[PDB]
Every structure is written in C-alpha cells, then in structure tokens.
Amino acid sequence: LPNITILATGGTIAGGGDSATKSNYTVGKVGVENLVNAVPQLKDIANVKGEQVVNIGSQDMNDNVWLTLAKKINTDCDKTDGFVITHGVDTMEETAYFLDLTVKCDKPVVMVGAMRPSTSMSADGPFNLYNAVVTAADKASANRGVLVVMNDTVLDGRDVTTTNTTDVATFKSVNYGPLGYIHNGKIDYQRTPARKHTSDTPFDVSKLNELPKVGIVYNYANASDLPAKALVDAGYDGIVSAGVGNGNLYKSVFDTLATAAKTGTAVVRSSRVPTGATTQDAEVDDAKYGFVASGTLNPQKARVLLQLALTQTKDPQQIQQIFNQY
Amino acid sequence: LPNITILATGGTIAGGKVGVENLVNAVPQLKDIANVKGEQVVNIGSQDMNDNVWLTLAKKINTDCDKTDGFVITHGVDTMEETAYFLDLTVKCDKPVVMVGAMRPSTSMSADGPFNLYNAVVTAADKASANRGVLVVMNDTVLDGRDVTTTNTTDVATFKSVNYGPLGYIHNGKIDYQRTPARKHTSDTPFDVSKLNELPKVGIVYNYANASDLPAKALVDAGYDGIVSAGVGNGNLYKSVFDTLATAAKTGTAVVRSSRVPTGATTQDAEVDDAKYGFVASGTLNPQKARVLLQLALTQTKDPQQIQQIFNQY
Amino acid sequence: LPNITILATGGTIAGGKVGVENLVNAVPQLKDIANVKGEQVVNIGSQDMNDNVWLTLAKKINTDCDKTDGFVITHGVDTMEETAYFLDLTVKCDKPVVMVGAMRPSTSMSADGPFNLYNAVVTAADKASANRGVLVVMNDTVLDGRDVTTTNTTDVATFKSVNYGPLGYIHNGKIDYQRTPARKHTSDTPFDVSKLNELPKVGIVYNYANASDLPAKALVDAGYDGIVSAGVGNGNLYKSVFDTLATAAKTGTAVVRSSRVPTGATTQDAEVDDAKYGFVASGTLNPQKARVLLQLALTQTKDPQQIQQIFNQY
Amino acid sequence: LPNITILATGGTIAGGGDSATKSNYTVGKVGVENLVNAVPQLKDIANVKGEQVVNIGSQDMNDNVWLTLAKKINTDCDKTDGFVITHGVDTMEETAYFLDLTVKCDKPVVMVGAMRPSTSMSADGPFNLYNAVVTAADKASANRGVLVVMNDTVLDGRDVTTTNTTDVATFKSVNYGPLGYIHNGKIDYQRTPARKHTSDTPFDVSKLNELPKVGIVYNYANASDLPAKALVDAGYDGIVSAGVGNGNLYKSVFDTLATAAKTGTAVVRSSRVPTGATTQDAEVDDAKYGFVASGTLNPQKARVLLQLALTQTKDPQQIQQIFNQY
Numbered sequence A, D: 001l002p003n004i005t006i007l008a009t010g011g012t013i014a015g016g017g018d019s020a021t022k023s024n025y026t027v028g029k030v031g032v033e034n035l036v037n038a039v040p041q042l043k044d045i046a047n048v049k050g051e052q053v054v055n056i057g058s059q060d061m062n063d064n065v066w067l068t069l070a071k072k073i074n075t076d077c078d079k080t081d082g083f084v085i086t087h088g089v090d091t092m093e094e095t096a097y098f099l100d101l102t103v104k105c106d107k108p109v110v111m112v113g114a115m116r117p118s119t120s121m122s123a124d125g126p127f128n129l130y131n132a133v134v135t136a137a138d139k140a141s142a143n144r145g146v147l148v149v150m151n152d153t154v155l156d157g158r159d160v161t162t163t164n165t166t167d168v169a170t171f172k173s174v175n176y177g178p179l180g181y182i183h184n185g186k187i188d189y190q191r192t193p194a195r196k197h198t199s200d201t202p203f204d205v206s207k208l209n210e211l212p213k214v215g216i217v218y219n220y221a222n223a224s225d226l227p228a229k230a231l232v233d234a235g236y237d238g239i240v241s242a243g244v245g246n247g248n249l250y251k252s253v254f255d256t257l258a259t260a261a262k263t264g265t266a267v268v269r270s271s272r273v274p275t276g277a278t279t280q281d282a283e284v285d286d287a288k289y290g291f292v293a294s295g296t297l298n299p300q301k302a303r304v305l306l307q308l309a310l311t312q313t314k315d316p317q318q319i320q321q322i323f324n325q326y
Numbered sequence B, C: 001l002p003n004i005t006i007l008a009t010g011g012t013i014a015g016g017k018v019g020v021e022n023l024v025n026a027v028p029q030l031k032d033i034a035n036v037k038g039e040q041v042v043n044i045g046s047q048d049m050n051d052n053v054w055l056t057l058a059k060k061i062n063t064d065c066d067k068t069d070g071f072v073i074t075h076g077v078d079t080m081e082e083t084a085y086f087l088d089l090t091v092k093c094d095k096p097v098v099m100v101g102a103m104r105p106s107t108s109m110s111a112d113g114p115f116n117l118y119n120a121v122v123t124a125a126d127k128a129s130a131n132r133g134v135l136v137v138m139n140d141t142v143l144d145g146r147d148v149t150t151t152n153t154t155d156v157a158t159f160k161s162v163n164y165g166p167l168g169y170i171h172n173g174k175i176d177y178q179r180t181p182a183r184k185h186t187s188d189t190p191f192d193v194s195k196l197n198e199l200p201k202v203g204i205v206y207n208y209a210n211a212s213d214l215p216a217k218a219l220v221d222a223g224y225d226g227i228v229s230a231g232v233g234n235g236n237l238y239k240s241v242f243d244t245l246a247t248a249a250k251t252g253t254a255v256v257r258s259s260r261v262p263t264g265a266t267t268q269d270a271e272v273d274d275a276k277y278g279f280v281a282s283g284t285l286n287p288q289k290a291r292v293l294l295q296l297a298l299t300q301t302k303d304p305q306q307i308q309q310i311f312n313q314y
C-alpha cells in the first residue's frame, strides 16, 4: 500500500454548520485528523499521513500559502508516494494551476474539496477524499501534472474551473475535457495535458519570498477606467483584463492599459466569457500595443501564469511565448 | 405582413461599419415575412456600449411602440447580454423586442449574420413572441434577456440561457415556444427611464487569490453609487476586498455580491451574513447583469432591504 | 405541516430491497417539513419497470388525491424519465407529484439518497410546486417530467431537462421557480387510464449504419400497435428499416420518428415526407418518451393526423 | 502547399433545397467538384483533388462503403499528403470510428459534414470544408487517429458524437473533449487520444469482403424481447444492447441475450444514456454471463468495434480486452 500525504489548507471540506439540512456554514474549521478518520476506508487503499498547512476559506487564498505548498511538496517529495491537498472550491482552480507550474516532484499531486460541509446530509467530502487518494495512489496518475479530483473525475490543473455556485458537479475542464473517470476505485485515463507542466517549466520558486504583483480588471458596458489606473498608480507588475467577448476592452480601460504597456507594465488580455480562447488576430493588434493574448486561460489562471512569467522576463514577446507553451 | 423596425447599433454583424439599410438589403427574404424599416441608432463595437445608448434605445422603443408591430436590434455580441437585460427592465412596449448579432462578419465564409437576422425577424413577427420580455435570437434559439449570456469566445453557438434554458427553438421559420420567464419584466417593472439622461454609477470588482483592494477603493474614492462584486464560488470575497466593501456598504455605497462562476445563484444563507454587512445577494444574475439591476434599483431606493427585494423579483 | 405520501417502487435509492419505512426513518428531518406516510407499491430495479406498475401508480394517485397534500415517488434512475412522463400525462390530481431516486445506495460513501429524498419532500410540500405537472427532483434541481432525462451513466448530477432547462433550484430548503412547462399535462390531457388494465403495445427500433430490418419486422409480425424509431440525426432511418416501417404505417401500425440524438426535436419538413408515409414526427420527445405518448395516443385514436396533433400538444 | 484528397460520400454538405430559407432538402446530390469550387479559398492552403466514392445520405451508410473507404485510403496513402472525407452527419460518428480502427496510413484523415445544405442561408458547409482541409494540411494533425472537423473544432474519431438534431454545433467529444480548436486557419492542439488507433490496432480489412453481423437492441420500460430474438434466430455474430442507465437490461431482453451468449453470440452491453461508461462491476456480472461492457462507447460505436473484434476472435474475455484497449 502506497504512502500518501494529505496537506490540509481548509475549505468547506473541513467546514461545518449546526444543521444537516440548513445551508449556513463556516469553513476551514475541522482539522486534518478529523477528515481522515471520517473516511476509515482510506485504510483499504493507503497509509495516509495528514499535515495542517493552513486552515482557511479558499476565498482568502494568497501568494504566501502558494509558496509554502510548492516548497513543501518539492521538499518532501522523497518521503512519500503522493500528495492530496484538501482545499476550498472557490480558488482551487488557481492554486491548482500555480502548483501545476511550480512543483518539480514527479509524484502525483491531487487537490480535492467539497461543496457541502462535513455536517451536511449527503456530504460529498468523504467520497471525494477517498477518490483523491485513489488517484494519488494510482501509478498511472504520474507525469500528468497537478490534478483536481472531484465528482468521480480526474481533471488537469490548467483547464479545470468551477462552473456552478453550488452543484457538487461544479468542477469541469471546460475547453479540453477531463483526463479520466473513476469508478470502483479505478481510473480509465484517456488523456493527458499537452501544455508543459511541473518539471518541464522554467519556473522555480524555491528561493522566492514573494511573487510579482498582478491584478485583474473586469470589462463591461460603461466600464470605469479607475480600477486599472489604480493598479497602474500602484506600480503593479502586470494587469490581466477580464475582457468582453474575445478579450475585448471598453475604450477607457483599453486606453489606460495601452499607456501602461508602453511604460513597462505587462498586460494580458483574457475574457470573462467562461469558455474558449482569447485569441490573437481578432479585433486587438497585440503586437502593436504590446499586449499578450491569454489563450484558454481565464483571467485568474492568466494571472497565475503572468506572475510566474514575470519572475523570468518583462518582455511582452517572451511572455506571449510563455502563454503559448504553458 | 407585420411591420418590423430594425434598430441598428453596430456589432460584427455589421462589420460596426455597414449601415442598417445594407444589412436589410442583404437578406431579400425578409420581405417574405415582414415590412422591415431600418433606423441607425449608433454604429459601434458593443465592447464600447454605454449608458447613453441604453437610455436612447429604451426611450425610442417606448416612444415608437405604436408605430410598429415589433422591433429587432442589431448589436454586438460582447455586451449583448447587458443591453438585453437593461431593455428587459425598462421597455414598456408590449410588442416583441428581439436582439441579434453575429460572430462572423458577412464577408467571412459561412457568415452567420444573414440567417441570424432572418430568424430574429421571424421571432419579432410571431404573435406568440409577445409578453415574453426582451429576447435574444441566435443560432435558431429564442432566449430571454434576463438569463441569456455568451458562453464561448468564438462559437456561433455561444448564446445560452445557462441556468433556466431557452424559451423556444426555430425551425423552418416557426417557433415552438415551451417556456416564458417568470421574473417580472417590461411593463411589470417600476423602472422608468423616460426622463433620465444618466444612470447611477455602478462598477464591478473581481475576486481571486491575493486580490488587491485598490480597485474597490478607487470606486469608493470616486463616490460610486454602487459596487458589484464578481465573487469567487458562491459570491465570496477575498478578505481585503471584503473589508473595503464592508466599509462602503455602511458609508453610502450599495454593494451587491454576484459571482465570477458562470452558472448558479449567489445565495443568501451560505458564508456571508448579508443582513449584518448591508450587502445584497445577486441570485442568478452575473456581475454585469447585476450591475444593470443595481443601477436601476438605485433610481428608486438606496435602501438595501428594498434593493434585495428588487433582486428577488426582477 | 403538510401531509405527504411517499409511494415506493424500488431503485438504488432503496438498495431495490429496503422498504419505504426504512427510507423514511433514515431521514428524521423529514418531520421538520411534512407528515410523511409511506406505502410500498413494488420494489424493483427500474430497468424492469413496466406498464402494470405505471397503471397502478396513476390510479393510486388519482384515487388518493383527496387524502393527502402531495406525493413523492421513490424510483430507479434508469427509466425514471419514462414513468415521469407517463404520470405527467395521466395523473388528474392537482397536487405535486415529485419523483426521486439515487445513483448510490445508502450504504455507500457520500450516498445521495437521503438529501435527495429530503429535497423531494421540500418540493412536494411547497405550495408553489402545484400546477407544474409531474416533477423529478434530483441534485437540488426541480425538473419537469416531459423534458427530464438521464444524461450520464454514473454521475449524481445526471438528471437534466436537456432542451428547455430546469423549472427551479433548491437551496436551504426553498425553491426559486422561474419556469413552468407550456405543454399540456395532467388534468389538461384527455388520457384517462382509470379503467385500463393494459396499454397498447409499442416497441422501439434503433437505427445505425447497415441496420437490420429484423427488429422492426419482428414487432410487425407480432401485431404491435405502434413502433417508435430511434432515428439517426433528425429522425432519419436506415433504408431497410425505412422500407419496413413504410409498409407498417399503411398496414395498421402507427409509426413515430424520434431520434437517438440526445437533444433537439425530430422535425417535420426535413428529409422525410411524413404525410406521404403516414408517419408522425416526435418533436423533442426521445424514443422512450415518444413511446409513452404513442401508447396513450393509441388509447384515443389510430388516425395518424390525430396522433401528430397529440404529439404537437402534449 | 500540401496535396489533399477529398473523398466524397454525400451528405447534407452536398445537399440542396429550393429555398435558402426553408428546411426541406435532399442529400448527396451535388458532386465533389461543385463543393470544391464553392470554396475558392482552398487554393490558399492546398492543392485539392476530389473523387466521388458514393453519393448517399449517411442514414444509408453501410459496411461496403466502409470497406471501400478503408481500402482506398490505405491504397492511396503514398500519393497524397492527407484526406478529407465529406460525409453526412447522421452516422459520421460510426464511419469515423471504423476508419479510426482500420486505416493504416500515417497521414491525417479528417471527416467533415454540414447541418445545412449548400443552398441555405448562412450554410455551414463551406467554412466546414475549409477547416477540414486546414486540419488535414497541418503537420501536427498526424498521429492523432481519424478526425472529425466541425464548427471550428478538431475531434477524435472514438469519442466524437452528434448531440443535437439540428444545431451547427452538434459535434462534440462528450466524455473526453476535443483535441484542438481552430481559429484563423491554425490549430492549438492540447490533446490526443490515448486509446490505440490506426496502425496500432490489429484490425486489417484489406482482404475482407464483408463484416461480422452485429445488431443493436434498445431497452426501455416493458421492452419486448422480440427484436433480440430475431437477431438470435438469424444467427447474428454479435448483439449490442442499448441499455438503460449503466447498461442495464429489461429482464426479457436480459434472459434472451444471456441464452445467446451461452450459445456463442458476442453480447456487448452499452447504454442509451448519452454520456459516461457502461461499466463493469455494477449490477451485471459480466463474467458470469459472458457479456462484454462497452466502456464509453455508445451502442453504434460499440457495434463498430465488436464487428472488428469478431474478425479476430469470438472469445468474450478477449473481446473485453479489445474493449479495454481500443
């Protein structure tokens, strides 16, 4: 039986409320031991060791917790057969991707959460955790990058996103689909991400105490340029536009970001549209403005890759190539 | 044959550089189904859509309701969902208003605009289309203005009512309607923009890991009437954004929680005590749609309980 | 507190080997929302669901309408969509009938049955749930019986109204309803099974490349009342199946074209001249749902024009 | 500029009606020359050569047309840089998979169709054909098995299915998602199928003049066993069950197929449910009955693979391993 290390960060998976049938709960409240012991069947499939890294709602996830997770996995790689990270849903898609690009360990890292607290009727957490361990324990799960496991499905860290505010089925890889489905503790993998990840990336956070500052501005009809200006005035290293349609920008926001791109701020166009690439060669001449197109990376995922890109380079043509490879 | 007025605003259906009369002329079969008259309102990319154009459309439809049997509005894709809901809430006319656009310009191969426009006229001309609110007609599908949204950056099939589904499907120039929106719309709303030349200022701040509070604070510093939060999961906020908006809500700004998540309601009774913070939960309204309703709510009340009631009825 | 009757039929929610009283006792919070009484009708895998059980359910609900405030039916997943539509068309009771099942048994980890049952009771107890036809409640979603279908072999979120969307979503024990089925149902249909001990024989044949005609011919040889074709694309037929069913339609068998394709209507005015062949086009009804309506149509008429009318109204 | 060979079989892509704005049409009517000449932009990207193989509605697709396509592609492999097959929508998913398992040629084979006839307003055919040639022309398209290209998307032959009766967007890979999206005549591939295809399969139809007889029976409430019996009585080689839920069968149908499996007929359980695997280890003890579970293969696809399996073997355990590998 493999050795599996659960790194706990909080989330609703570790959350509780007063009633099995009322929606009110709080988060990252129960400890890693409690979760494990709630799933005795884990003994059938793994020797599980739990460690509490933080205990927070993933709505409060942040760069320092990402640094700690990356360093820890890379540090402790030799001591275990794989990692499960228990985490809230809200920003799982971000942390997954950060880890997808910064872990160098060749053992599976599988992230997991729940939409219902442990106390709720038909809570999803227990089986989700079980399945995350199955996955981390499967030899065939290696060399697929960092994963998320929810609702019987194995998802790659890059494409995976939450699609619904409440559904147990929220996590989908919305552009290229899942890697594998889980049934009866076994996985039939039929896909692997082609974009470079983990040890094929140049990103190394081992000696980083902070990450480049990147903020996200939303576009909409009659959008204020004040948010963008505020990030410019603060000397942000980069800005991601949550564009409309195929990464389009309101004229005010466009004008502000075009000025900033000239001064040296990195500007990535992404889109608020939930599926599909923000493309080159549509309505915005990126080359002319010095902007980068995000491809299928949603704004928050684009921020993740931009911060990491910014650790290697400030040159927009090089940042674009990074956005084309990872 | 019914009389249908086409109000043109631009968009890639018009690529917005072609005039309304050119668009009509390009689809001669429109005369088989309506007597079409075209008026140019503006001619822009909808990524530059704004409050002034919104007010102009609403007033025009309301003023000209009696001179026609139905309206089609040619518009860009990118913010179609925003204009549609705004008109859903402010048009007082009982006659069909159908918005339409295109993902490809009419010079591209297999250009979608011509048949899209045809179907939008079919819809606007169909008796059965009245009393269903403002509609968007794309890819053979009639969609209500409240729920409709663009789901893909490039797909001709992008427009979807992602929470509650379409109203009807169009085949061979006819619609089988099986659904109508229950939320109150058009003449059942109190919003009346007939005399307004501007709208309350409402901005949208995004949430993500490690989010800066600076965008929220910049809207507060400018005295924005309202701030919508594109929250994470079920409308949650990064702590520094939460702190900023908690202050704002008790200091003369209305604050709506919505979600960056593409489907599902931002609910009450989850992790945020909205009553405690003076916040309004947006339900199924996404950030940009929530902004629309907030702006219009603020024409009526600054009372956050009354704003929430509005968000529970429209 | 309303009185709710649970009619049990089996399914994996009962894994069907557990009794109704066991299922009720397993969710004590049901008493917070209703006075629940359980009756066992049968206890089977819904893959063995049949005409006799359908008739029993319909008669029971119709007979007992006045003794209760609402019904929940515990049922298997696999043919839930079929039983739901049958009851959608034959129940005459004005009170909510809500069907429910589970993908995982009670003993399995994160078993879905208990909360599913809770929610189905919430639904059946809600005033607002009346007059919406027969409902299926799964994964926090209220779905009409006409459009609902299972979309995945194992996913707890499998149940979806794939053409027209859900009616409402359930959060914290309350439903925000935004939709109601337009097709006529329950007391607005003519179908009355009160006196029937059997139904017209209706079978289904599949289409694919190189399809044999032998299945179709075997139902014709048995004198079946009707055949539904699970067509390819927009309800098309493989030539040898087409030839067989063309004969059957003029030789005393009713023939409905539906589609193996999971969404979208089988339409008239595409590649098959239904009037020429004496065929009926199923619309959005999938093959198993088309069978339901055909059987019930054949209790009223064998005239294929009247059958098509029925298919255009229910 | 690459040499690309279009093999035309008919379909609505080659169909026409009297009105641009009415739904009535007939199929497989226009010739390959007309289609090509309707898309002059193809000269920008390829030297296209057309040949008419058949001109039929894909609703009448059949084994002999499959054999002719496979042999032809295998025969003519050395003479061209890749193949586009113009084909109806209705059974494209079947022909695609057959070809996915029997083509041995290492050049791209890309299938394509249209939901609207050429005569219709906003007809989808032209750009569809263009994009099919782009794909067949792209070096990076090789070694991915047989493809389908519709609505700007590149799809693998195995998972691809039609999901709606009329929508231009119908074609989706519903379990594992697409391989690549096309924009501005370029593809960003991020996936490739893991199941064995083309030259990695043992199936060789070069000398076959017919295929093993395999029929499909549907399950539903009160299902008749007469269809299944009729295929048994005719000595069919195999039978595919379009099962309910996770490949379950009505008792009558179950009893008939269980008897047949004992006599030597190959029985594959599939499902009428549009997504997800028909699994082992659920309600049916396949080993006990001698049945084969189809995995994510829909009934029509399962038939394609069962016919080909039957060319190598009649042994259920071997057929199961084929269903686990291809």
Ligand SMILES: NC(=O)C[C@H](N)C(=O)O
Binding pocket: A010, A011, A012, A013, A027, A056, A057, A058, A059, A087, A088, A089, A090, A091, A113, A114, A115, A116, B233, B236, B271
């Ligand atoms: N269901 C969840 O886990 C949501 C929670 N707010 C989180 O992200 O921590």
Ligand SMILES: NC(=O)C[C@H](N)C(=O)O
Binding pocket: A245, A248, A283, B010, B011, B012, B013, B044, B045, B046, B047, B075, B076, B077, B078, B079, B101, B102, B103, B104
């Ligand atoms: N396809 C389109 O219409 C996009 C364009 N930018 C618009 O929204 O005006």
Ligand SMILES: NC(=O)C[C@H](N)C(=O)O
Binding pocket: C010, C011, C012, C013, C044, C045, C046, C047, C075, C076, C077, C078, C079, C101, C102, C103, C104, D245, D248, D283
């Ligand atoms: N999950 C289930 O209920 C499946 C079971 N075979 C049934 O339909 O009865």
Ligand SMILES: NC(=O)C[C@H](N)C(=O)O
Binding pocket: C233, C236, C271, D010, D011, D012, D013, D027, D056, D057, D058, D059, D087, D088, D089, D090, D091, D113, D114, D115, D116
């Ligand atoms: N759209 C199409 O091509 C449908 C046609 N019946 C076919 O499959 O040939």
